Design a protein around this motif. Structure first.
Motif, PDB file in Angstrom:
ATOM      1  N   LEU A  55       0.845  -1.175   0.000  1.00 50.88           N
ATOM      2  CA  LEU A  55       0.000   0.000   0.000  1.00 50.88           C
ATOM      3  C   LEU A  55       0.891   1.240   0.000  1.00 50.88           C
ATOM      4  O   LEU A  55       2.043   1.205   0.474  1.00 50.88           O
ATOM      5  N   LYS A  56       0.361   2.340  -0.518  1.00 47.44           N
ATOM      6  CA  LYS A  56       1.051   3.601  -0.529  1.00 47.44           C
ATOM      7  C   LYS A  56       0.020   4.628  -0.050  1.00 47.44           C
ATOM      8  O   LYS A  56      -1.098   4.724  -0.624  1.00 47.44           O
ATOM      9  N   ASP A  57       0.304   5.340   1.016  1.00 44.75           N
ATOM     10  CA  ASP A  57      -0.602   6.245   1.676  1.00 44.75           C
ATOM     11  C   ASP A  57      -1.931   5.581   1.955  1.00 44.75           C
ATOM     12  O   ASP A  57      -3.008   6.182   1.764  1.00 44.75           O
ATOM     13  N   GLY A  58      -1.924   4.305   2.340  1.00 43.32           N
ATOM     14  CA  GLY A  58      -3.109   3.585   2.708  1.00 43.32           C
ATOM     15  C   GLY A  58      -3.914   3.005   1.578  1.00 43.32           C
ATOM     16  O   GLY A  58      -4.962   2.420   1.828  1.00 43.32           O
ATOM     17  N   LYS A  59      -3.446   3.137   0.358  1.00 45.43           N
ATOM     18  CA  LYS A  59      -4.150   2.703  -0.846  1.00 45.43           C
ATOM     19  C   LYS A  59      -3.399   1.598  -1.570  1.00 45.43           C
ATOM     20  O   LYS A  59      -2.199   1.580  -1.597  1.00 45.43           O
ATOM     21  N   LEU A  60      -4.108   0.685  -2.178  1.00 45.73           N
ATOM     22  CA  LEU A  60      -3.553  -0.493  -2.789  1.00 45.73           C
ATOM     23  C   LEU A  60      -2.629  -0.081  -3.906  1.00 45.73           C
ATOM     24  O   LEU A  60      -2.950   0.742  -4.746  1.00 45.73           O
ATOM     25  N   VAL A  61      -1.467  -0.710  -3.952  1.00 47.24           N
ATOM     26  CA  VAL A  61      -0.587  -0.594  -5.061  1.00 47.24           C
ATOM     27  C   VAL A  61      -0.891  -1.671  -6.098  1.00 47.24           C
ATOM     28  O   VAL A  61      -0.901  -2.849  -5.770  1.00 47.24           O
ATOM     29  N   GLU A  62      -1.130  -1.257  -7.336  1.00 46.32           N
ATOM     30  CA  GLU A  62      -1.590  -2.153  -8.399  1.00 46.32           C
ATOM     31  C   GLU A  62      -0.533  -2.664  -9.329  1.00 46.32           C
ATOM     32  O   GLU A  62      -0.800  -3.560 -10.126  1.00 46.32           O
ATOM     33  N   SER A  63       0.647  -2.074  -9.259  1.00 45.36           N
ATOM     34  CA  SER A  63       1.750  -2.367 -10.187  1.00 45.36           C
ATOM     35  C   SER A  63       3.052  -1.913  -9.549  1.00 45.36           C
ATOM     36  O   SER A  63       3.053  -1.193  -8.571  1.00 45.36           O
ATOM     37  N   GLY A  64       4.136  -2.331 -10.135  1.00 50.52           N
ATOM     38  CA  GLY A  64       5.464  -1.864  -9.790  1.00 50.52           C
ATOM     39  C   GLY A  64       6.160  -2.594  -8.653  1.00 50.52           C
ATOM     40  O   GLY A  64       7.095  -2.058  -8.089  1.00 50.52           O
ATOM     41  N   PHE A  65       5.704  -3.810  -8.324  1.00 46.13           N
ATOM     42  CA  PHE A  65       6.415  -4.653  -7.357  1.00 46.13           C
ATOM     43  C   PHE A  65       6.557  -6.075  -7.885  1.00 46.13           C
ATOM     44  O   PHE A  65       5.812  -6.521  -8.748  1.00 46.13           O
ATOM     45  N   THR A  66       7.587  -6.758  -7.382  1.00 42.43           N
ATOM     46  CA  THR A  66       7.880  -8.144  -7.728  1.00 42.43           C
ATOM     47  C   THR A  66       8.144  -8.931  -6.464  1.00 42.43           C
ATOM     48  O   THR A  66       8.663  -8.426  -5.553  1.00 42.43           O
ATOM     49  N   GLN A 114      11.565 -26.574  10.007  1.00 40.97           N
ATOM     50  CA  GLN A 114      11.891 -25.866   8.769  1.00 40.97           C
ATOM     51  C   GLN A 114      11.089 -24.613   8.601  1.00 40.97           C
ATOM     52  O   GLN A 114       9.878 -24.658   8.712  1.00 40.97           O
ATOM     53  N   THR A 115      11.772 -23.530   8.279  1.00 39.01           N
ATOM     54  CA  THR A 115      11.107 -22.235   8.091  1.00 39.01           C
ATOM     55  C   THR A 115      11.528 -21.671   6.751  1.00 39.01           C
ATOM     56  O   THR A 115      12.519 -22.085   6.110  1.00 39.01           O
ATOM     57  N   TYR A 116      10.788 -20.656   6.340  1.00 41.20           N
ATOM     58  CA  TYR A 116      10.898 -20.136   5.015  1.00 41.20           C
ATOM     59  C   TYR A 116      11.115 -18.613   5.052  1.00 41.20           C
ATOM     60  O   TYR A 116      10.861 -17.963   6.089  1.00 41.20           O
ATOM     61  N   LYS A 117      11.520 -18.085   3.922  1.00 39.09           N
ATOM     62  CA  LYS A 117      11.733 -16.673   3.679  1.00 39.09           C
ATOM     63  C   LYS A 117      11.158 -16.305   2.338  1.00 39.09           C
ATOM     64  O   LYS A 117      11.336 -17.023   1.367  1.00 39.09           O
ATOM     65  N   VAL A 118      10.566 -15.112   2.260  1.00 37.49           N
ATOM     66  CA  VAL A 118      10.190 -14.506   0.970  1.00 37.49           C
ATOM     67  C   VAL A 118      10.493 -13.036   0.977  1.00 37.49           C
ATOM     68  O   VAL A 118      10.319 -12.392   1.997  1.00 37.49           O
ATOM     69  N   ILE A 119      10.909 -12.525  -0.146  1.00 40.14           N
ATOM     70  CA  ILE A 119      11.111 -11.126  -0.353  1.00 40.14           C
ATOM     71  C   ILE A 119      10.255 -10.540  -1.456  1.00 40.14           C
ATOM     72  O   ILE A 119      10.030 -11.196  -2.491  1.00 40.14           O
ATOM     73  N   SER A 120       9.774  -9.318  -1.287  1.00 35.82           N
ATOM     74  CA  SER A 120       9.050  -8.560  -2.284  1.00 35.82           C
ATOM     75  C   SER A 120       9.725  -7.205  -2.396  1.00 35.82           C
ATOM     76  O   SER A 120      10.126  -6.640  -1.390  1.00 35.82           O
ATOM     77  N   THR A 121       9.755  -6.675  -3.600  1.00 41.28           N
ATOM     78  CA  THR A 121      10.422  -5.431  -3.898  1.00 41.28           C
ATOM     79  C   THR A 121       9.452  -4.483  -4.595  1.00 41.28           C
ATOM     80  O   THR A 121       8.974  -4.820  -5.658  1.00 41.28           O
ATOM     81  N   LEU A 122       9.277  -3.284  -4.042  1.00 43.43           N
ATOM     82  CA  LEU A 122       8.477  -2.205  -4.602  1.00 43.43           C
ATOM     83  C   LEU A 122       9.363  -1.125  -5.172  1.00 43.43           C
ATOM     84  O   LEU A 122      10.206  -0.583  -4.453  1.00 43.43           O
ATOM     85  N   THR A 123       9.172  -0.758  -6.430  1.00 40.50           N
ATOM     86  CA  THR A 123       9.861   0.360  -6.998  1.00 40.50           C
ATOM     87  C   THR A 123       9.237   1.664  -6.499  1.00 40.50           C
ATOM     88  O   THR A 123       8.022   1.846  -6.527  1.00 40.50           O
TER      89      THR A 123
END
Lengths: 97, 110
Positions: free
Chosen positions: A37-48, A56-65
């Motif tokens: 979210l950006k300023d409380g609003k859904l981001v629709e694009s620009g992340f991977t 056993q445990t796991y990790k995930v990463i997400s990146t927002l431009t």
């Protein structure tokens, strides 16, 4: 069951477009989602979101431009993580304002 | 062997904790993330320094991965102490690629 730690890493105090990196770590079982979210609003694009890996445990990463002027202008960014019926929100902004 | 066709230097960026980024029981910890991107050939070395001194533990460098000339990316993650961060220690991600060195330096100061 282990719910994730949710942490966001941000561009440096002394300046940079760049990225916000949301990491969800130390979780099990595997199914998890990440969005933004950006300023409380859904981001629709620009992340991977990267493949989930074993730490056993796991990790995930997400990146927002993000843009530097929006960062310096104190826009608030939120990583939303969902795991096992819980929703986690981690908010970040520029420290140097 | 198959030769790489191109030579491209890495871009190096470091991602830091926000001001509320330290967690767990005291003494609290966080992380720095170094990403090197847009390089070829694939072999690369990542090192971390704290105030110029080599860091020999507390980091994990992930396998180099693929990102038209093929380029590559690598991520490394360093565990840091809040006390060191707030004492204004300077952290360096040092990336060596094809005999050239590229640094990115960060600290807590604005």
């Amino acid at each position: 069951e282990m719910n994730p730690n949710v942490n966001v890493f941000v561009p440096p105090r002394d300046g940079f477009k760049s990225k916000l990196i949301c990491e969800a770590t130390n979780f099990t079982p595997k199914p998890i989602t990440v969005s933004w979210l950006k300023d409380g609003k859904l981001v629709e694009s620009g992340f991977t979101t990267d493949p989930v890996t074993i730490e056993q445990t796991y990790k995930v990463i997400s990146t927002l431009t993000i843009s530097e002027i929006d960062w310096l202008n104190l826009n608030v960014y939120t990583c939303r993580v969902d795991h096992r019926g819980l929703t986690f929100l981690k908010n970040v902004s520029s420290t140097c304002a």
